[PDB]
Amino acid sequence: MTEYKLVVVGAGGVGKSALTIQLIQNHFVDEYDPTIEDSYRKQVVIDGETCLLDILDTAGHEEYSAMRDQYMRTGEGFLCVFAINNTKSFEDIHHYREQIKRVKDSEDVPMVLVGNKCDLPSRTVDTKQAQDLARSYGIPFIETSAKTRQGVDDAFYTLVREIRKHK
Numbered sequence: 001m002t003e004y005k006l007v008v009v010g011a012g013g014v015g016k017s018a019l020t021i022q023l024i025q026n027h028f029v030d031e032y033d034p035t036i037e038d039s040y041r042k043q044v045v046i047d048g049e050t051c052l053l054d055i056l057d058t059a060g061h062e063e064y065s066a067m068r069d070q071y072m073r074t075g076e077g078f079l080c081v082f083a084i085n086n087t088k089s090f091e092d093i094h095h096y097r098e099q100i101k102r103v104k105d106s107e108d109v110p111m112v113l114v115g116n117k118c119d120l121p122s123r124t125v126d127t128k129q130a131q132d133l134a135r136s137y138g139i140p141f142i143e144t145s146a147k148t149r150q151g152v153d154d155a156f157y158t159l160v161r162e163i164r165k166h167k
C-alpha cells in the first residue's frame with residue numbers, strides 16, 4: 001500500500017486539530033487544546049486506490065525551530081488552513097507557503113488551501129478572495145467546517161490527488 005505523508009499547517013485556532021480529528025474519529029472537538037506536534041494514521045480509498053495517510057498536525061503558534069523544519073521536511077503535501085472568520089489567519093497563509101517552499105527546497109510543493117469554520121456567521125474572508133489566492137498559487141481551495149464535516153474528506157483526498165499529480 002502507498003503511503004502519503006500529509007502535514008496540516010496554519011495559524012493558531014483555525015481548526016487544524018478539529019479537521020484531523022473529524023477525519024480520523026468522526027468526532028467534533030469543541031474545546032481548544034493547543035497542539036505542539038501530533039501524528040495520526042488512516043487507511044482510505046481515493047480514486048479507487050488504497051492508501052495509508054500519515055497526518056502530521058502542527059502548532060499554529062510556534063516561532064523559529066530547526067525541529068519544526070525537520071518534521072515539515074518529511075511532508076509530501078500540505079494543508080494550509082485559515083479560518084474564514086479570521087482575516088489575519090488568511091494573511092498568514094503567505095508565511096506558511098514560504099516556510100513550506102523553504103524547507104522543501106522547491107517552488108512546486110503539493111498544497112491545498114483550506115478555509116475552515118464556514119458554519120460560523122462571522123465570515124470576514126470572502127470565497128472569491130480565497131479562490132483568487134489559491135489560483136495565484138496554482139492550488140486548490142476547499143471550504144470546510146470541522147463541525148458539520150463539510151469538505152473534510154475532500155480536503156485530504158484532494159491533497160492526495162495533488163501529491164499523485166506531482167509524481
Ligand SMILES: Nc1nc2c(ncn2[C@@H]2O[C@H](COP(=O)(O)OP(=O)(O)NP(=O)(O)O)[C@@H](O)[C@H]2O)c(=O)[nH]1
Pocket residue numbers: 010011012013014015016017018019029030031032033034035036058059060061116117118119120144145146147148
Ligand atoms: N464552529 C466551528 N468551530 C470550529 C471549527 N474548527 C475548529 N473549531 C473550534 O476552534 C477552536 C480551535 O480549534 P483547533 O482545532 O483546536 O485549532 P488548531 O488550529 O489545531 N490550533 P493550534 O494551532 O493551537 O493547535 C476549538 O474550540 C474548535 O472547536 C469549525 O469548523 N467550526
Ligand SMILES: [Mg+2]
Pocket residue numbers: 016017018033034035057058
Ligand atoms: Mg491543534
